[PDB]
RNA sequence: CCCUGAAAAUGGAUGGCGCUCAAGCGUGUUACCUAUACUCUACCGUCAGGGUUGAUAUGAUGCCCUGACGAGUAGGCAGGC
RNA sequence: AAUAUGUAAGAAGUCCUUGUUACUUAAUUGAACGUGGACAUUUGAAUGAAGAGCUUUUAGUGGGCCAUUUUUGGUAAGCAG
RNA sequence: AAUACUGCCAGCUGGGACUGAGGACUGCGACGUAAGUCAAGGAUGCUGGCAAUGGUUAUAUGCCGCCCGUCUUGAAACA
RNA sequence: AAUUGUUGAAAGGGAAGGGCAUUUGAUCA
């Protein structure tokens, strides 16, 4: 009789997506990436500022 | 008054190509035409018997009749808000074969060959053609290909 | 607004419910609507759709035509169903036993069937015996055999029965039909 | 007549099993998304580090919205719009990128704005204005049952599966897109951002390809 | 009192309101304009093969 | 808009006849990446026989100022199409960043020569590291030692449409 | 950019008032107002897809469910006073 | 050149064997129609389709204009074409 | 390291306006081990005032609004 | 009914008449 909008009604959101509860529990919307570090090559570094 | 004849405004249409006048090469008369074959129509100026009209120049049609030296072509002409069939008899000279149909038979033969070979094992035949899909990822290496800086040139007044 | 690709609020173009005011016909239409709505056999839907056909769309079916249809292989033990009127043909002499269900039966055709050994039942009885139309065969008469359709689509080089009142000589047989007086059609 | 409880229990058991399969598939899809995004990021990183440049693959999906009315339209672009299912202003559809589709978009570019969509905006669109086409009717999608009933032959049975088929073009992307009614969006909440819409994006307007900038406009209009 | 002579405006729209229809094709096309000898021999061959089929399969 | 420097490196589509096509890099001042790519392609199909359909972009990046907090003198060579013909100019700006300098130059040209962004072409932007090669007086006057200039006739902004005291423009 | 070139008849037109680091001119960025335009909702009509003789219970041309649309001269059809 | 435009992108198809003819060929040599037999995921490029096809009847219409682009006559025209 | 810019959150929350359609249950979901409950296929509870709201017409105010019918590509015309 | 006279009510800076919403006056379940 009436359309309820997901992302605003938690009951409808959970009904549509059963994975929403697990997503909220694990806080997958804010996940820290691996702290890896790589250095660009001197060729690219010089080409960036080569005028 | 006004003039609309059988050969009106065909000065540059019913004209032989440059350095291609004279007789016709003896290859058209050796072509075999059968009922159902798709052929194109291109008028030749040397022969004035059985010449097609201006509208039927460049049109593509099926062969429905075979005669001594002529074939019948069915051409769909758009008059008003409908297409009407036209059965016109033309000489062999002003008619050539169409390579699109031949490419279709070649594709059909390759299609059947792949349907046999691939389905002998039964995995992902994919007999249908696909359009130009977007290019996948690629990596370019600047080993001897260092990008050269380019700048717009100043305006010049060369004569 | 919408750039409509088709006509808006256009009718389906099909006749729903009979245009006639025959009370018995409306009752039969209601019965067959109930059948076709609460069953799954396409025979009920076909019969219901044919019940809405007009007089020109419901040509009579002859007993000779019924016999010809039943002469087919495996059609001897089948119930003939005619949505319309069944007429009597005097050009046939041997009528096999059958079971024909139709709206109206000509007296001569009914007498012929009774004498042969068959019976004349109505659509309601046919539905009662076979709710799903089992072992039935639908017969329709010739629709293009009317004299009013010959004149349709008249044009040059067509020969489509020009609309005339009198027939014979000097009645649309002059120039326009002969090559000796100009052109032929 | 006491079997109503038995059918109720059987229905609950079947629904729970279906929900379990849906949850497993959703978890798999989320893991695949995270893995793909991280893989692209690290591939770019290694290409930068190894003295090279990473040429990203061209986007295979675009979103096209109509920014022009239904008046003063040439017949060929009008026909192309009808074939692309853009008959109302502020109506949007998803398009798989091929040569034919690119040449189709190049013809009705003056009347549409199209760009590469993202997963977040695709999910928001499907959740908010997601409507299906069942019996030539616009039935809203508020349950996975309707989606499974109308798309189970192609392996799609949930709204998350439909979103996955939209974002990643697969074998049944054509049917997945055809099942969805074109999205009827409203005018942008924050405005179009330009004084004249009927100018190219490089020229300062909404007309033309916007690439990744289409996400902001789509979310503002949705 | 001169008047406009000829114009093709709106003719395309008029013809496209009722979509331009390709001719309806059938498996057996019309056999008119065909060589009379070929038609006669085709009739004879058709009678022969019909008789052969009737004699073989009943 | 707020111009940003984008460097774009592109190349022709690889072919079996000529593998590993040459890479061409250009720096463009543009509002966004789409405008930067469009300008890159437009400039490329003016000096080289290439096109978007017969080419691709292998890299696009944004150049940030190394020292955006230092005041610099920039010399810019430009070529523009006027109402009657094409002319070449060299303008000296004083700004802390290349993007700000080119934005100021664009406003200057659009206000003084009625040249639009479709007309102004950035030929070259450079920084004059020695304060002796400057040949423009409006720039030289701001490089003098001990620069002190007042601000006469200060105009204040009032939050009310009526004032009960006669304003003073002292400073 | 501005000025001379540049002169027509009732008294008058960037609409006028008026405006001069403009409220004039080119360009760059935000906020603001609105169409019978767009999204949602309530009602009416039309069309399409359907359910409803397991009833006392009548109008299955009746009732109900879902979706879409609603401009208009000449003109056609349909329902009504 | 661009634009505009015709045809083909399959089951009315392809392939294997062989029945008919008063056509034709030196000739079971070719042509047409065939019988039997083999190939349904992916039926043979993308997209779309309040479904498509067909028949009857008839109201009004047969003075047009304007806008972008191409362009004729004319110096030009709110001129004609 | 921090910060600017862009994009994400199935992160939370403050304030304001419009709407209350449907009418015993039927379905999809959540909380609750379990009873039962819920913001879950369309709003209820409590309380206050009166027994004035509102309908018709005249004037007034802010805005809009050319004379009916025909001929005409063009009507309100000084047709 | 056109037209006209009185009584009672309202308006009237070179027209009257109408539509969108409301105040005021009269009247109304």
Radius of gyration of chain B: 26 Å
Number of strands of chain C: 5
Element order, helices and strands of chain C? Answer: HHEHEEHEHE
- Largest sheet strand order of chain B: 4-3-2-1-5
Task: Count up the helices of chain C.
Answer: 5
Report on the structure:
This is part of a larger assembly, with chains A (51 residues), B (159 residues), C (185 residues), D (222 residues), E (58 residues) and F (171 residues). Chain C has five helices and five strands. Chain C has helices spanning 23-38, 42-51, 63-70, 107-116, 123-129, and strands spanning 61-62, 79-87, 99-105, 119-121, 136-139. In chain C, strands 1, 2, 3, 4 and 5 form a five-stranded parallel beta sheet that branches. In chain C, helix 1 (23-38) runs antiparallel to helix 2 (42-51). The relative contact order of chain C is 0.13. Chain D is an alpha+beta fold and 222 residues long. Chain D is 48% helix and 14% strand. Chain D has helices at residues 4-49, 75-83, 99-107, 119-129, 144-151, 159-167, 173-179, 214-221, and strands at 52-55, 61-66, 91-96, 112-115, 131-134, 137-140, 183-184, 208-209. Chain E is mainly α. The chains are: A mainly alpha (51), B alpha+beta (159), C alpha/beta (185), D alpha+beta (222), E mainly alpha (58), F alpha+beta (171). Chains in contact: A-B, A-D, A-F, B-D, B-E, B-F, C-D, D-F. The interface between A and D is medium-sized, with 24 and 27 residues. The structure holds four RNA strands.
Would you kindly provide a brief summary of this structure?
Chain B: Keywords: Cytoplasm, Isopeptide bond, Ribonucleoprotein, Ribosomal protein, Ubl conjugation. In chain C, 28% of the residues lie in helices and 14% in strands. Chain C is of the alpha/beta class.
